[PDB]
Structure 1
Amino acid sequence: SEFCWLTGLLEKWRFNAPEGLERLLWIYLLIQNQYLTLLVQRDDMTELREETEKSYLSRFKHAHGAGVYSQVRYLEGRFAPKSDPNKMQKLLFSVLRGYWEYLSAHMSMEWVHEKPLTISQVLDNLELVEPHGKCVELALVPHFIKRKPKNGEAYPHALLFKDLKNQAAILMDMLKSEPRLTGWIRGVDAAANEMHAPPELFCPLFRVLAKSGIAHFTYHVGEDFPHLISGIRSIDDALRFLPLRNGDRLGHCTA
């Protein structure tokens, strides 16, 4: 709607443009560009609850690109775990339903249910597909967040630890209640920054998730170290203390 609008508008100004209405186009572009820079900087509620399900289908379609054969094969998404189990069962459901809607449009294979209405029926629908070299293969990876250090509680990041253990525990019972989900929730990430939480804090947290069948863990070293030597130590701390098997990945190793 926006793009087709602008093609029509400029076409009538192809030869000349009134000064008055031209300035309106000028300020609108300046307003739009200003907001875009603001949006980028804040990154580095209704925000995600607009429709919460159509976006994921559009996201995968945008990743797929034009043509019968997509441009990206293996893709995993990052999503912060929600505070309530009644919300995680909805956020995860909308992603899988969005992904299944992506698969239904392209692959005209038989589906167990036309409308799944729940996470379980999506798993039944998604169990009938195989990776044939052009469909985006998806394996979700929830990512945690590190908060600012709050004083007290016998160690500086404890409400953080109490917060993450609550979010992690919600993830735990989802996997045991839905054993088929272990094929789509394949990883766990901790991506906020470096100093707001020491890397060694996640060590007991990652280990307990390993015993619950996550099977993969990636860390995201914050690239705002106060000194280059400190940054080297931070990656060293992630290597030594965090439980990382062969084939794991780190994030943003700028140090």
Structure 2
Amino acid sequence: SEFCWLTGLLEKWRFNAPEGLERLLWIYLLIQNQYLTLLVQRDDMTELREETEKSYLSRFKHAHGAGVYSQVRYLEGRFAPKSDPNKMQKLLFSVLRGYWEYLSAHMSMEWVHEKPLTISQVLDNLELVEPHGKCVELALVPHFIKRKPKNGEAYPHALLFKDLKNQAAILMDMLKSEPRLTGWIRGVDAAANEMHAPPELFCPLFRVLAKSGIAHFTYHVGEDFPHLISGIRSIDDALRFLPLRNGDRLGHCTA
């Protein structure tokens, strides 16, 4: 609708345009551009429920691109963990159902449940898909969000650690409640900022998560270091303390 409207308006203004309406189009473009700049700079409930699984389905179609064959094969999806177990179950159900919708749209094959409506039936449908490389292969890596260190509270990062421990708790009890989710929940990330939480904060979190079958860990090194030596030390600390096994990754090693 956005493209068709503008193409029609520009077609009717091919040779001349009224001055007032021409300025109206100018104002609309300026407002849209300023909002887009505000959004991108800010990036680095009801609104989420407005799209829900539709946004994820559009994401997988966008990753697939035009043509019968997907231009992207291996896609690792990052989502913000939620402290509410019910919200978490809805979140992963929407993402997985959208992935099944993308696969069903591109691949025509027998499905156990035409309308799964739950995680277990979604995994029942998804386990029939074989790795063939013509579609998008999805891996889910939730990214823990570090926060500001509150004053006092024994050790400097106490409330933040409790919040991260809680978020890990819902992730763990779900994984034991559905063992097949270990084939889709493939990693754990921590991408908020480096000053707010040091890499050594997530070491107990990552080691305990490793015993839950996560099997992969990536850590974002926030590149707002006060000094270049500080950032280099931050990357070294991540290698030294975090349980990064063979094949793991580190995020944004600009230092």
Q: How would you bin the TM-score normalised by the shorter chain?
A: over 0.9
Query: Is the partner of 1:253 in helix, strand or coil?
Result: coil
**After superposition, what is the alpha-carbon deviation per residue over 1:132-159, rounded to whole angstroms, capped at 9, x for unaligned?**
1111001100110000110121112110
How many residues of Structure 1 are paired with residues of Structure 2 in the alignment? 255
Displacement after TM superposition at 1:95 (Å): 0.2
Displacement after TM superposition at 1:10 (Å): 0.5
Higher mean Cα deviation, 180-189 or 79-88?
79-88
Displacement after TM superposition at 1:173 (Å): 0.6
Query: Is the partner of 1:75 in helix, strand or coil?
Result: strand
Could you tell me the TM-score, scaled by structure 2's length? 0.99
Q: Is 1:50 aligned to 2:50, yes or no?
A: yes
The aligned residue for residue 142 of structure 2 is 142
CA distance in 2, matches of 1:139, 1:77: 6
**After superposition, what is the alpha-carbon deviation per residue over 1:62-81, rounded to whole angstroms, capped at 9, x for unaligned?**
11000000100000111011
The aligned residue for residue 221 of structure 2 is 221
Query: Is the partner of 1:156 in helix, strand or coil?
Result: coil
Could you tell me the TM-score, scaled by structure 1's length? 0.99
CA distance in 2, matches of 1:138, 1:53: 15
Higher mean Cα deviation, 183-192 or 146-155?
146-155
CA distance in 2, matches of 1:30, 1:147: 34
**After superposition, what is the alpha-carbon deviation per residue over 1:171-214, rounded to whole angstroms, capped at 9, x for unaligned?**
00111000000000000000001000011010000000000000
CA distance in 2, matches of 1:155, 1:233: 22
Higher mean Cα deviation, 175-184 or 43-52?
43-52
The aligned residue for residue 237 of structure 1 is 237
CA distance in 2, matches of 1:147, 1:111: 43
CA distance in 1, matches of 2:150, 2:129: 47
Higher mean Cα deviation, 148-157 or 231-240?
148-157
**After superposition, what is the alpha-carbon deviation per residue over 1:17-72, rounded to whole angstroms, capped at 9, x for unaligned?**
11110000001000000000000111113332213111111110011000000100
CA distance in 1, matches of 2:86, 2:133: 35
CA distance in 2, matches of 1:133, 1:234: 37
Higher mean Cα deviation, 230-239 or 75-84?
75-84
Higher mean Cα deviation, 133-142 or 45-54?
45-54
Higher mean Cα deviation, 79-88 or 21-30?
79-88
- Summarize the alignment of residues 109-124 of structure 1 with structure 2, pairs less than 5 Å apart: 109-124=109-124
Displacement after TM superposition at 1:236 (Å): 0.2
CA distance in 1, matches of 2:190, 2:46: 24
Displacement after TM superposition at 1:117 (Å): 1.1
CA distance in 2, matches of 1:151, 1:47: 33
CA distance in 2, matches of 1:252, 1:200: 17
The aligned residue for residue 201 of structure 1 is 201
Query: Is the partner of 2:46 in helix, strand or coil?
Result: coil
Query: Is the partner of 1:151 in helix, strand or coil?
Result: coil
Query: Is the partner of 2:215 in helix, strand or coil?
Result: coil
Identity of aligned residues (%): 100
CA distance in 1, matches of 2:37, 2:62: 22
Query: Which ranges in structure 2 are unaligned for 5 or more consecutive residues?
Result: none
